[PDB]
Amino acid sequence: RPAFCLEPPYAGPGKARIIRYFYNAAAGAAQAFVYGGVRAKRNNFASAADALAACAAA
Structure with missing residues (x-):
C-alpha cells in the first residue's frame, strides 16, 4: 500500500466540520474522522470506498 495509508x-x-475517512491499517479497516477543512494530509477521503480503493487494493 502507499506509505500514507x-x-x-x-x-x-481548521474550524470546518466535515466527515471524512482514513484507512486504519492497525484495524485493516476504513474509519470515520472529523476534518477541519485546512491542511489535510493524504490519508483523507470522502468515502470508506475511496479509502479502501487507495489503501487495500490489488
Whole structure:
C-alpha cells in the first residue's frame, strides 16, 4: 500500500466540520474522522470506498 495509508488521521487546525475517512491499517479497516477543512494530509477521503480503493487494493 502507499506509505500514507499508515498515517494517523489529521483533523488539522481548521474550524470546518466535515466527515471524512482514513484507512486504519492497525484495524485493516476504513474509519470515520472529523476534518477541519485546512491542511489535510493524504490519508483523507470522502468515502470508506475511496479509502479502501487507495489503501487495500490489488
